[PDB]
């Protein structure tokens, strides 16, 4: 794991969310819903980061062992576009 | 199956480029991304 | 609902169709030129508890853009404003009500096989909207005089059609209930006279009726209505009865 | 007013049948040789029909390619279109309450014809981007020169659709068959050309010209009359004296 | 006006017929043989036509692709499809009432005639999904290096396409038929070649060359004559050369 | 155990099953000489039961009907090429089950190029792709079945001889419905039980001698399709009848 | 360096062909193989690619008969854009597979005349045909060929142009017939039997019968491929628990009883 322990993986307050869900004021409920949408966006961001890390790890391991065994002087050229194509993700995203 | 410029199929997807998505990428800011996430979580109500 | 032919064999078939209407089993029957079995089944569904449900009938002859699965689930998101005014899809309209299918003989055999597979699985999914389907709403189809020999000939997949319908509606003979066909012709003539603002029915010669028997009505009610309409229009008057019967609209003079 | 020729007794029966068809809003087909002008007859009938002030659609058959109904016929005024989404008018939708004439409908795709017939019989627009299909009171008309009796038997068109598409189909008598409006059309065209070519007057068709016209097979019918007028345009060079032989066949070669 | 007249009786009659038809704006067809030059004759007629101060622009008929026949007929309004660049200039729209001299009419495919069927009607420029068709009466004219009546017998073209020609098909006589200005035409072509070959003067090859041409079939009526003259000049490359032993048989192989 | 579908009591059927078990232990191409309506993946089901990938079921699904261009697309699918978009290897025949055994049917309709692709599949060969290079190599065994004698087609030059030979490593002949005579009664009883279960019928109420005679006189082109139709007709009739009701037959067309 | 496993046989023709392949290995010229069906000409071509090409040179085995649509065959030449339904991404790769390597094909008889002519107009000059509008690439790719039909036979048929047939056939490598080899055939059969015994993971020796050898001699075996040997080894595999098998089945439909 790419420092999975160091990964934040922070989550919103479920108790406060329940309080926002139980908010009597309609405007307060709407604000709580907006905060929940922002929290869902953050969760999606974290999940995307983790997935990108895992995919990059797999793509590297596809050839990293070959480079490690062959040696530094026996290093094959690596293309960012080729790596992205192998991972099938966006090339700019990989860059 | 080699005709050119035939009837165009309806697009069923969008780029949907959002500055939120780019910040989510964070260019893999790592510890910097952690600090930014902490700052946002502080700015985000009912977070952590 | 509306006046319909009442041949004895047709009466038995209508009774069977009404009995089957309460069950939501899929419907797919071959159709003659006159057809009307589809209308009878629709009336039966109206009589059954399936009434007040959706009655989306798509004549499967026009495909827009990719269609196919996109036709099956028309809820497509992206390349738009982010909100769709009304994009339920063929499956969604089929869900919760009767789903009649037409123009199916010319529809792609692969499309039919996929629809039959989805009839059990219900693996509906689309960018705009997805659903596990399995709505259990009754389905109907128009085989359009499909030949089982064609399945044997391989034009259409035999399994794809067999899994679609375990039972079908038989076709009553056109020769049966010839006298009642005269009554239907009279009713249609009265309807046209009301539509054409004609004074009244001037009558019909018995020789013309016998000639109608000779024509044998190849299109059944479909041919009969057109023949009666042509006879009325060529009559152009309601003073005396008509003693001329036109077998075909095409004629030489 | 708009109607032309019609002096024939068979043409009189045709006018009577047109009056009868006016009572019935049901669509019909006009049959005639090349250059018949039965399309103009249908247009004049539509003008004399219930919608005295109404639209008309020329809608030639071979004008839409690789396009469904909602590209030019039904239209895509709604959004969510393929690629870019925008308003797009439709001829079939726009012509409702008017006339939707089909120019040479016999030369249309067979499967597309079947789909169009299925739509028309059902009376539902369907298409995409619309909440309700509704129905259209546009006058559906058709006029060509081909004979459907053979094409349908050959599978060039759907037989059931053709029967449904056929209600009061009538075939006009050939102009060569009539052989009466020859002089009338000749005089009318001579006046029209003399006004057009600024000629002082019609030179006139001599007895030889009349005999040639009588003997003319006239395959083009009214188009053959137009060809006769075109030949007289050469005889306009002979406007000083009566035209001896107005009739000419372009296929033959002079000298 | 930059065309060398045939300066012959048949050529003079053809020019006279062209001048007579010049004010007339009705559709035309040319049945001149191979190497006629009607590509230039019709252009000069358009220069002398009624719309002399009019925008005249011809276009190749068979050149249009099979996929985009509608696009060639009229530019798609870009409401649908991937195209998002408004409406392309339609054929009638590109003509804009001017001369659109049709070349290579014989080689068009069936769909081309199907589109022409609508094009037969006056104006009515209906784009892909447009609001309403526009009337653009443009001077129509055609030519056929092949035999159009023979095509009609074969049925490759449409009968309405035959009806498209409103005037008589002017035909050019064969090079064997005319053989009148062959000497003068050869002299002019030789002068033009010598100007091109950077020779102030050169004895033209006409001694017994007129007899040989009289014995020649000369399929390349206008072209191959000057072509052979220039070829012989290039082969000789000399001015002080008698008009003898000059011949061109490019297809044939010398020993 | 795969529910032991279509348990054929015939000794020839048992020998074919043993041979199929041997082939499933192997991972090499094998030919199944079948006929229409006969052995419709039942042998394939047995092979999956005895497959080396017993835990991971193979793709199977040999039966397929498609156009020539459609079959070619099923062979090679790229996102950019062809009409469909954003889906490369949409068929994914090898992608359906890694290893296992690729299963094919109606190879007679396959074109010469299609037959050549099949041959390259039979040996160690790369994947088919419309564009680019397909160095991707997915090992998977081969299974196929057609109702015709491909020796004649090769003699007629309608299929690649190399494909016909290499594919025909070991032809698995199949018995048709006409072959099954004594086991027909057992198959009928099993179908009756299955229909009674599926149609919620209390049980198989019983057969009639006239019904058995009619079934024997029936051509019965399908090994189970005829049995399936007979069972369906009997279930529909006897469900209301609660009795043998003589013979119930299913006809596409009914008169009088 | 590394040698691919090959069947052992006393076939001086095979050794001479190998020596000729070695001689042409430093050479970079077109090579044509007269291999008939099942002669394993592909294996010989690959062995050449080991030595005839530069070490670790790119190789590609594309059969023109395998081509489905001639439009796709055009797509086999690189398309820049505006081709087919989707012109978003276009990379034929065949020329890329060609670049820095040799070209190997089998049964080049079936090609359309236009395909062969384009192949000539590409190979002889070295430029690459592009389906989309682009400057052609002079990709340095060798060409190796292997077909059953006689080149003069097609010349009489006229399928290959004289220029195309000539520039296509620079060197001739006749593949020895399987029926031609008799003793080498037996030795290769024994070697393939040993390899099959290893593959089947059966410790017991396969064993053979004299009548079986006589029948195999009777068998035409037009294809020298391992496939015919594999069929023989499968006929052996149908027998088990015996040290030396007896008899064999020509075909599974054969001897159905
Ligand atoms: N029993 C009936 N009673 C009244 N009208 C009928 C009857 N059967 C047929 N018709 C008329 O005949 C026509 C047949 O139409 P349709 O069922 O669409 O034919 P098809 O299904 O063969 O296309 C209908 O428009 C209907 O008005
Ligand atoms: N009723 C009529 N009276 C006089 N001329 C007519 C009449 N109908 C048509 N024409 C002439 O015939 C031609 C009409 O051809 P067109 O309208 O294209 O016929 P079609 O019905 O074959 O399409 C014109 O030259 C027109 O003047
Ligand atoms: N009267 C003329 N004077 C000079 N050149 C002519 C004349 N008529 C035709 N040409 C020559 O003919 C050539 C045009 O070919 P053309 O005859 O138009 O072919 P087509 O008739 O098949 O269209 C031109 O190069 C032109 O020089
Ligand atoms: N000398 C040899 N030693 C071992 N195997 C051989 C030999 N010659 C041919 N083969 C075998 O024949 C099989 C097919 O040969 P070939 O006919 O060249 O293939 P292709 O069908 O592509 O032409 C190969 O798998 C190869 O193992
Ligand atoms: Mg119908
Ligand atoms: Mg020219
Ligand atoms: Mg090979």
Numbering used by the authors:
A (entry chain M): 288 to 382
B (entry chain M): 1 to 48
C (entry chain 1): 6 to 258
D (entry chain 2), E (entry chain 3): 5 to 259
F (entry chain 6): 3 to 258
G (entry chain 5): 2 to 258
Q: What does the study report here?
A:
Bacteria use sigma (σ) factors to recruit RNA polymerase (RNAP) to promoter regions of genes that need to be transcribed, with 60% bacteria containing at least one specialized σ factor, σ54, responsible for transcribing many stress response genes. The σ54-mediated transcription initiation requires specific AAA+ proteins (ATPases Associated with diverse cellular Activities) known as bacterial enhancer-binding proteins (bEBPs). DNA looping enables bEBP hexamers to engage and actively remodel the RNAP-σ54-DNA closed complex to convert it into an open complex. In this work we capture intermediate states of bEBPs in facilitating DNA opening and partial unfolding of σ54, and therefore link the ATPase activity to DNA opening and σ54 remodeling, which eventually lead to transcription activation.
To understand the structural basis and how DNA is stabilized in these complexes, we determined the structures of PspF1-275-RNAP-σ54-DNA containing mismatches between −11 and −8 [RPi(−11/−8)] and between −10 and −1 [RPi(−10/−1)]. Interestingly, DNA with a partially opened bubble between −11 and −8 did not support transcription, suggesting that this complex is unable to proceed further to an open complex. In the RPi(−11/−8), we observe multiple structural conformations, at varying degrees of tilt of PspF1-275 hexamer ring relative to RNAP-σ54 and varying degrees of RNAP clamp opening We also observe significant degrees of promoter DNA bending, demonstrating the wide degree of conformational flexibility in the complex. The DNA density downstream of −10 was generally poorly resolved, indicating that this region was highly flexible. However, one conformation has sufficiently high resolution to allow us to resolve the DNA. In these complexes, we observe a previously unreported interaction between PspF and σ54 RpoN domain. This interaction is only possible with the tilted ring conformation, suggesting this interaction contributes to the stabilization of this ring conformation in both RPi(−11/−8) and RPi(−10/−1), giving rise to the higher-resolution reconstruction of these conformations. Significantly, we observe the σ54 N terminus is further shifted along the PspF hexamer in RPi(−11/−8) and RPi(−10/−1) compared to that of RPi(−12/−11). This would thus support the mechanistic model in which we proposed that ATP hydrolysis and the conformational changes within the hexamer lead to translocation of the σ54 N terminus; and RPi(−11/−8) and RPi(−10/−1) are further along the transcription initiation pathway. Second, PspF1-275 hexamer ring tilts, as observed in RPi(−11/−8) and RPi(−10/−1) structures, altering interactions between PspF1-275 and DNA, which could contribute to or stabilize DNA melting.
